Each structure stands twice: as C-alpha cells, then as structure tokens.
C-alpha cells in the first residue's frame, strides 16, 4: 500500500499468534513493543531513546507479521510508549519513504 | 525520490538559516530538533517517548526546506539527541511509506 502521513501509520501486526496495532516507525532503528509474553529465549538489552534507556528483553528471529507482510527479526520487548516497528522489519517487508 | 531504509533516512534541512541533518521520521507527530537559539515567541511543551520525557519549546509557523521542498508549521527545539523530521511537515513535502 501507499500511506500517507496525516495520520499515525498504525497497522496490525502478529506475533506469537496474537494480533497487536504497532506504529510504522522509519526513525526507529529496532522494533520495540510493549510488555507482552513470548515463547523462546530472550536476552537483556538496554535501548536509548529521545528520554533516555530502558531495559529491554531481545528475542531474536522471531516471526511477526505486519499488514499481511512477513518478516523473521529481532523483536524488544519493555516499557516503550507504544509498539513501534522498526527498520530492522521495514526493509524485510519491502517498506521505502516516497516523495 | 524514494529513500530506502537500510541505513538511516538522514536528509538535509535548512531552518533559521543553518543547515543541519534531520531523520525522516513517520513515527514523530511533529518536528523536534536539537537545541538551537530560534527568534520568537515560543510555548512550553512535554513530549514522551522510549526513555521518558524530555521539555521542549514549541515555535509555530516556522519555515523548513526539506530536499529542495518548503514547508512551514511547528517545530520543537530542545536536548534530543537527533534532529527528527515529524509528520506535521512530512505531509506538507508529500512524502509517503510503501510496500
Ligand atoms: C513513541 C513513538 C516513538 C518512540 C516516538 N519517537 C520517534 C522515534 O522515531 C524515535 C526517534 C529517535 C529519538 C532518539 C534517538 C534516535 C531516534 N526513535 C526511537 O526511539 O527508536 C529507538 C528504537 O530503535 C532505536 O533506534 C533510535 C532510537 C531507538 S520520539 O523521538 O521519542 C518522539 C516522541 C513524541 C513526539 C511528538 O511529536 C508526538 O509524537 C515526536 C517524536
């Protein structure tokens, strides 16, 4: 699709099978989503953002679907404002800014 | 032109008469850049985000040439770390996401 920007670019993504919104984020180097339960191993990571770091767990190569695209990456999981995809998905699902 | 995110989607403004590189950033309700000493009057703001809050100052109406395309609307100037390009002035250049 092609989405214009005078609204959030939130979509429906999947992960570990349950359906979430998350915000298209192209200043997010990561994918970051809220608290939530997933299967698999995790490590503990430490993000920054524009008001400082946050502990975060990373899952890698997980699967997470995302407006019917399908990508396989690193997912962290903590206490972000909002679940925000990242551009280590928006380049597997073929995601480019247009003007 | 269409900016692929393997790498950062860093592009050059021109604000107050500086140049400076800025983040094309879908994520970002509005323009937020590093601290910068701007003419005018100005209003206190709060903006949150990974990390928590940080206090910014709000201009409206101020002019930005973004790639060769001028828009004008709010920015907020304060300590972030990146100078981010919101969606307040991505719409008014045009700019899209695809996949
Ligand atoms: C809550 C939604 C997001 C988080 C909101 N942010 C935009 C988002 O693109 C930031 C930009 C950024 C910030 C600092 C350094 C580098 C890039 N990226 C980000 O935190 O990414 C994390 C994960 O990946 C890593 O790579 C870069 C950092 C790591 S914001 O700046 O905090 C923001 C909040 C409120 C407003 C108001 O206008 C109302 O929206 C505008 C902007």
């Known amino acids: 699709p092609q989405i214009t920007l005078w609204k959030r670019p939130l979509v429906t993504i999947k992960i570990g099978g ?47 679907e995302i407006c019917g695209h399908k990508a396989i990456g690193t997912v962290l999981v903590g206490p972000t404002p909002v679940n925000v995809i990242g551009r280590n998905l928006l380049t597997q699902i073929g995601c480019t800014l247009n003007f």
Request: charge should be negative; avoid cysteine; glycine fraction near 12%.
């Open 18 to 64: 349950q359906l979430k919104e998350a915000l298209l984020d192209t200043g997010a180097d990561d994918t970051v989503l809220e608290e939530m339960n997933l299967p698999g191993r995790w490590k503990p990571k430490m993000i920054g953002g524009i008001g400082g770091f946050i502990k975060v767990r990373q899952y890698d190569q997980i699967l997470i």
